[PDB]
Design an enzyme around this catalytic site. Sequence first.
Site, PDB file in Angstrom:
ATOM      1  N   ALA A  86      51.352  40.857  93.300  1.00  0.00           N
ATOM      2  CA  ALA A  86      52.645  40.258  92.978  1.00  0.00           C
ATOM      3  C   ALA A  86      52.694  38.797  93.410  1.00  0.00           C
ATOM      4  CB  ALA A  86      53.786  41.047  93.634  1.00  0.00           C
ATOM      5  N   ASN A  90      57.821  37.602  85.634  1.00  0.00           N
ATOM      6  CA  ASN A  90      57.331  36.503  86.441  1.00  0.00           C
ATOM      7  C   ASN A  90      57.748  35.170  85.868  1.00  0.00           C
ATOM      8  OD1 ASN A  90      56.239  38.434  88.046  1.00  0.00           O
ATOM      9  ND2 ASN A  90      54.092  38.039  87.453  1.00  0.00           N
ATOM     10  N   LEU A 142      61.986  21.798 104.455  1.00  0.00           N
ATOM     11  CA  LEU A 142      62.133  23.223 104.735  1.00  0.00           C
ATOM     12  C   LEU A 142      63.163  23.480 105.828  1.00  0.00           C
ATOM     13  CD1 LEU A 142      58.448  24.387 104.558  1.00  0.00           C
ATOM     14  CD2 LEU A 142      60.244  24.445 102.759  1.00  0.00           C
ATOM     15  N   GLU A 178      65.862  21.988 106.274  1.00  0.00           N
ATOM     16  CA  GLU A 178      67.203  21.934 105.710  1.00  0.00           C
ATOM     17  C   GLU A 178      67.615  23.266 105.083  1.00  0.00           C
ATOM     18  OE1 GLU A 178      67.911  18.138 103.566  1.00  0.00           O
ATOM     19  OE2 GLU A 178      69.854  18.956 102.846  1.00  0.00           O
TER      20      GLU A 178
HETATM   21  N1  GTP Z   1      57.821  40.992  89.865  1.00  0.00           N
HETATM   22  C1  GTP Z   1      56.560  41.388  89.989  1.00  0.00           C
HETATM   23  N2  GTP Z   1      56.284  42.498  90.754  1.00  0.00           N
HETATM   24  C2  GTP Z   1      55.009  42.917  90.898  1.00  0.00           C
HETATM   25  C3  GTP Z   1      53.953  42.256  90.274  1.00  0.00           C
HETATM   26  N3  GTP Z   1      52.805  42.916  90.591  1.00  0.00           N
HETATM   27  C4  GTP Z   1      53.119  43.957  91.405  1.00  0.00           C
HETATM   28  N4  GTP Z   1      54.477  43.971  91.596  1.00  0.00           N
HETATM   29  C5  GTP Z   1      55.275  44.897  92.412  1.00  0.00           C
HETATM   30  O1  GTP Z   1      54.769  44.900  93.742  1.00  0.00           O
HETATM   31  C6  GTP Z   1      54.688  46.240  94.207  1.00  0.00           C
HETATM   32  C7  GTP Z   1      53.225  46.636  94.231  1.00  0.00           C
HETATM   33  O2  GTP Z   1      52.544  45.767  95.089  1.00  0.00           O
HETATM   34  P1  GTP Z   1      51.316  44.785  94.703  1.00  0.00           P
HETATM   35  O3  GTP Z   1      51.698  43.331  94.944  1.00  0.00           O
HETATM   36  O4  GTP Z   1      50.798  45.122  93.315  1.00  0.00           O
HETATM   37  O5  GTP Z   1      50.244  45.346  95.780  1.00  0.00           O
HETATM   38  P2  GTP Z   1      49.183  44.470  96.577  1.00  0.00           P
HETATM   39  O6  GTP Z   1      49.868  43.421  97.419  1.00  0.00           O
HETATM   40  O7  GTP Z   1      48.145  43.873  95.619  1.00  0.00           O
HETATM   41  O8  GTP Z   1      48.575  45.493  97.669  1.00  0.00           O
HETATM   42  P3  GTP Z   1      47.431  46.605  97.398  1.00  0.00           P
HETATM   43  O9  GTP Z   1      47.025  46.707  95.949  1.00  0.00           O
HETATM   44  O10 GTP Z   1      47.954  47.893  98.002  1.00  0.00           O
HETATM   45  O11 GTP Z   1      46.183  46.180  98.129  1.00  0.00           O
HETATM   46  C8  GTP Z   1      55.427  47.104  93.197  1.00  0.00           C
HETATM   47  O12 GTP Z   1      56.789  47.104  93.561  1.00  0.00           O
HETATM   48  C9  GTP Z   1      55.190  46.328  91.913  1.00  0.00           C
HETATM   49  O13 GTP Z   1      56.142  46.585  90.902  1.00  0.00           O
HETATM   50  C10 GTP Z   1      54.222  41.123  89.502  1.00  0.00           C
HETATM   51  O14 GTP Z   1      53.290  40.523  88.947  1.00  0.00           O
HETATM   52  N5  GTP Z   1      55.541  40.700  89.354  1.00  0.00           N
END
Ligand code: GTP
EC number: 3.6.5.-
Lengths: 351, 423, 54, 442
Positions: free
Chosen positions: D12, D228, D252, D254
């Site tokens: 994410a 995104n 930051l 602020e």
């Molecule tokens: N908004 C948004 N949410 C995301 C995205 N990718 C994953 N998520 C959300 O993040 C959570 C999953 O975590 P990730 O960030 O995929 O996991 P990670 O940090 O890569 O950790 P691990 O795979 O367990 O090693 C869920 O709630 C997903 O829906 C993204 O590209 N955009």
Amino acid sequence: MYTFVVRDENSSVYAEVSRLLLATGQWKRLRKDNPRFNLMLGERNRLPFGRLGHEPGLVQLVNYYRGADKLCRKASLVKLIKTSPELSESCTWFPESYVIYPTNLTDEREVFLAAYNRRREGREGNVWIAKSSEGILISSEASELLDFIDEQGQVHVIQKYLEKPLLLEPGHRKFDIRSWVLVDHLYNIYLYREGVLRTSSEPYNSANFQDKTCHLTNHCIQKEYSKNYGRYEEGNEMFFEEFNQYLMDALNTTLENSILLQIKHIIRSCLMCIEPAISTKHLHYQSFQLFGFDFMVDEELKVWLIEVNGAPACAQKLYAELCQGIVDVAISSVFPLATSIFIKLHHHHHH
Amino acid sequence: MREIVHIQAGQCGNQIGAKFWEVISDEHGIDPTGSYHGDSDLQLERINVYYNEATGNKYVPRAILVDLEPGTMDSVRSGPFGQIFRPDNFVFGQSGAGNNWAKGHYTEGAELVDSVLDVVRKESESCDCLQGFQLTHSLGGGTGSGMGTLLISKIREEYPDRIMNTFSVMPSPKVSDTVVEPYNATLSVHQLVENTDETYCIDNEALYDICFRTLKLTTPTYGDLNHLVSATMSGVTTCLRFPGQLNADLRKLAVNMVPFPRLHFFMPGFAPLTQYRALTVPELTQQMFDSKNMMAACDPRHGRYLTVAAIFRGRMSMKEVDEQMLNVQNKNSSYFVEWIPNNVKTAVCDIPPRGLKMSATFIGNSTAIQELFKRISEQFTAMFRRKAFLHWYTGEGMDEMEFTEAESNMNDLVSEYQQYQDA
Amino acid sequence: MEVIELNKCTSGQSFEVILKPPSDPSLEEIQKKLEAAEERRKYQEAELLKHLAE
Amino acid sequence: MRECISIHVGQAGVQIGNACWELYCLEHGIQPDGQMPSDKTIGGGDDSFNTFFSETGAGKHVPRAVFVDLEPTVIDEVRTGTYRQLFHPEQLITGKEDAANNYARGHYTIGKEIIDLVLDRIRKLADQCTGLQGFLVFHSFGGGTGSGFTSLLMERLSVDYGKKSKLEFSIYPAPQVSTAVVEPYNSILTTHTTLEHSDCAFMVDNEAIYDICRRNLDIERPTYTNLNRLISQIVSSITASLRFDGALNVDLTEFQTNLVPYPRIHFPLATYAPVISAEKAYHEQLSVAEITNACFEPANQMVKCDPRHGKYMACCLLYRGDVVPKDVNAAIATIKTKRSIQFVDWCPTGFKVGINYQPPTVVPGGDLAKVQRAVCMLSNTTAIAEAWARLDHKFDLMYAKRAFVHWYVGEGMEEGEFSEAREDMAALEKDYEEVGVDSVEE
Ligand SMILES: Nc1nc2c(ncn2[C@@H]2O[C@H](COP(=O)(O)OP(=O)(O)OP(=O)(O)O)[C@@H](O)[C@H]2O)c(=O)[nH]1
Ligand SMILES: Nc1ncnc2c1ncn2[C@@H]1O[C@H](COP(=O)(O)OP(=O)(O)CP(=O)(O)O)[C@@H](O)[C@H]1O
Ligand SMILES: Nc1nc2c(ncn2[C@@H]2O[C@H](COP(=O)(O)OP(=O)(O)O)[C@@H](O)[C@H]2O)c(=O)[nH]1
Ligand SMILES: [Ca+2]
Ligand SMILES: [Ca+2]
Ligand SMILES: [Ca+2]
Ligand SMILES: [Cl-]
Ligand SMILES: [Mg+2]
Ligand SMILES: [Mg+2]
Ligand SMILES: [Mg+2]
Ligand SMILES: [Mg+2]
């Protein structure tokens, strides 16, 4: 198949509503803590509004308005009236009222005696009632009021006692009027066409404000501490057909003209005042709620609001009808199944 | 999490494993000689989960074939995709195991197991990042059951931080080779409870009943049972073999499906049960949750779902899939434990299986799986209380106490499911 | 309704409008925690391997 | 000029970083190969945009950014994609096996082996700074890396850069797109460990973004790309004052000063308007009054909740496009007489307003229509604690049965850390209630 959860087991109204919902054969009751419900008949205290409306695939509805307590608590109602421009201190249908905190614990104690003294000076009837949101005192001397308040530990209200009430004959006796109002998810305000007069069965007596069964028309205090419970009407309860025929016979008026116009004006004013604070029109969940408004009628046929109840019971004769109405306009409006008993309160005067 | 090492053990293990490699080699556009001939490159993005790349761009299954007699593995080597397998990965004895768990686990199998582990190690060492192992076997015989659980123990000793996954065929008296299957199965379940992370319970009872009642096959063969099995296996490994978000490796699947270490026995399901009629997303969804589509002969209404993984395959509306999944949960909410919020997870893959434009695979962790273990327990006790047929086992050095213990552990597992069904 | 601290530039402007006036662990501790966790992992693994040796 | 370093952790964090840096490049006229024709001081400078980009002698503008993921597939798409040339290899850090949606695995097991490499790459970036302000950290609550590794990294940044400010952008978990049953656990755990290390954190509930995409962009089933691009617009609206000339929120420090009077209550609600579909054939452009009014509709918030039933401690309006102060003050005057906006007693009822005249930039071929004016409201309201209430309820449901706890204990975490984190969250909910609520059969 719609689903619902029951989280107030001590509610006459919503016990009857649950039974009707099941009898339709299109509603299934779930366990109180299963989250996949369409309908929450919720608890009265600390209802988790913050967890509603986050269930994908479920339109969710709850039988309380978050924020409606401002109307339904003695001190919050007096604050809301005095501080809201559309109700104002120049509000002709609410009795003069002041909020007072015990010494043990803003507060208005100083402003209260400011007017109390021009009623001492002014020769005016200076009788006041003290109440909290059991524990009532009626007196013409302020210091009995204030000391009784500080003897208890919670916030009280001091309100002008209405010394010239309308008195039913035969009996020379007091009463109050209870109206039931349903507010739906669209903020339509529906007055149930049946009200009830909770009468006192004792003659009124403007000389001893301490024997409080000719002064407090509460069905509980009449069902035991009074001698004549049930003499004139069953359970100290007169209904609108009767009260109307009485007004026609004794006063040459109707219930509509002399009292109901004022009652509708008061209900619409209160609910329209708080509407921006509580409406669920663009929210992720939706609310309806049933209120009980309690009114007093003085001898000039002027109506006064006494209080608003956020969780009322019904008159036993009326449950069947009122509860069916709740399922009709509040619940099936949102969740359709496979001569209205309500008056819609609406008014658009142009100026 | 990339490579999976696959092991198939015994007659049933090897027959279903050969069908599995046929099916998914077809899905990935790999031909019997190991040459890629597909059109989509979703076929190749995660091909290395199950295949090693040789030169010539030849794809060789990361598959080890194990038996105590050479019969079924000769037939595998002569079957459709027989030559795709690496010849050094055929590991076999001569003596057989006589449908006897003790011979597979303690005597005959003990002689062969190091050979097997040499192949397992040579395969693990060429792995950039081994996720773990999947084993196909039956529990009712002696090789897949006894030697299979021996292998699982030894693999866990040497790779304690890798995922262990099995497809385990449960015996049924309706489709039965010998009377001692309840013994073999109880002894094996005791091992599985301790040493696997995720076990797909495939009930020969349920496969039979599906073939009979639903597919209108009057005289089901093992061939017909294995069609159901290989379809289900392809479905349940879709998320590991194609790009995707949800349950895309063995550990993440385990983390989503296993809330308690011992309760890792899954009820698989498949829809449509195999015609040219088009199946709609609502129809897929209703069938995949239908008791008559489950491969473990348990009534889902007799228990509650702890967790569920659903996999829809083919071109369809994501919006409609989400709506239908939400609908089954919302209208049968009593059957999903309320203390695991949002316990149903849904994946969608664009490539459908051969012959279908649309399919669905169901993977349930239901407390109703206890019905399977109770069934085995009753068949076990009926014989064990007269110590019938035990001499086949005491002749290989086993003592009755080991049976008493395996029975007690299986009854404990049943009790644990009942506990969470009433929580 | 009072506007204060107005600042202008070619890019834009900022200001404030008032409607009403007022009515850490060390490197040491961190590495200790990470290592205690690794030791609990190693103990659990040794217990497993002891059981398998039996 | 003072520099900011952006840290993107997990899937994410990395995918949202992709979208934000794409947008930034569009907004500053930086081409995918790193060249910026309008930058007339080749190979150096201390303009406002240099807060986020450094410069090479060849005239390449290089994000001050670290991407960290415990598995390679997501950062590999950065390495090979449209902005391949923007980033230097040493800024993209991958492991090989991820945290399996397991906070304890990202924090204790795999975190321990990668933390020092990450801090060294961050130190390289900080070494090219004349006056580092601090860090912007992007991550999910729900993932194993996003939760576990981020909390480890936050603690160590407090150690190695003890006086720098740290801002978070945090994706709160939503079942409609979530990947794991244990995301409530991970969320609570990472919030507990990160609370004292974060100065200001912007929560984005994927459920709110998802419904905004369906309702206002007419996407039947939004993807992470849709989500995104919208999130990147909000983030850019929030950082624009660090990257452009102006006098509001210019460093930051602020942000904390303007939005966070109480340091634990450091989660401002973001509200964004207008969101307009690019395929909407005919659209009437919204006025200052209409977009400012939309700032007070829960349907436009990054977290669904009801600010009428809480109190405000601060409020900042950030406008982009054709906006002048007189129209803002008229809109605010109108709005205050029709809406429930209560501040805590110990704060002035008022708004801090920033206007940048350039309207929002949108990605060519994205879902978002170009508009003439847009606004992002940052308000610190107690009503955001509704989100904490939701998380804590789900946590309580599972932990009462210890469902899934063995996955965390097996990584070396002690079960008592669960109840420590949960009691910290109980204290936090209590604080929001103290600040924001008054004493309250017939
Ligand atoms: N908004 C948004 N949410 C995301 C995205 N990718 C994953 N998520 C959300 O993040 C959570 C999953 O975590 P990730 O960030 O995929 O996991 P990670 O940090 O890569 O950790 P691990 O795979 O367990 O090693 C869920 O709630 C997903 O829906 C993204 O590209 N955009
Ligand atoms: N200002 C006032 N003047 C005259 N009588 C009053 C009065 N306020 C209350 N009363 C009398 O007391 C009774 C109302 O008491 P109160 O307002 O506290 O209701 P309650 O909370 O005790 C039970 P409920 O909620 O069902 O009405 C009425 O019946 C009325 O006769
Ligand atoms: N579904 C299925 N079950 C099989 C097959 N072959 C044998 N079985 C079952 O497997 C058990 C016998 O085990 P088998 O694999 O022949 O013994 P092993 O060679 O010693 O491992 C009995 O439960 C049989 O019903 C098969 O091809 N398919
Ligand atoms: Ca021998
Ligand atoms: Ca420059
Ligand atoms: Ca700190
Ligand atoms: Cl420092
Ligand atoms: Mg009352
Ligand atoms: Mg056999
Ligand atoms: Mg050897
Ligand atoms: Mg990841």
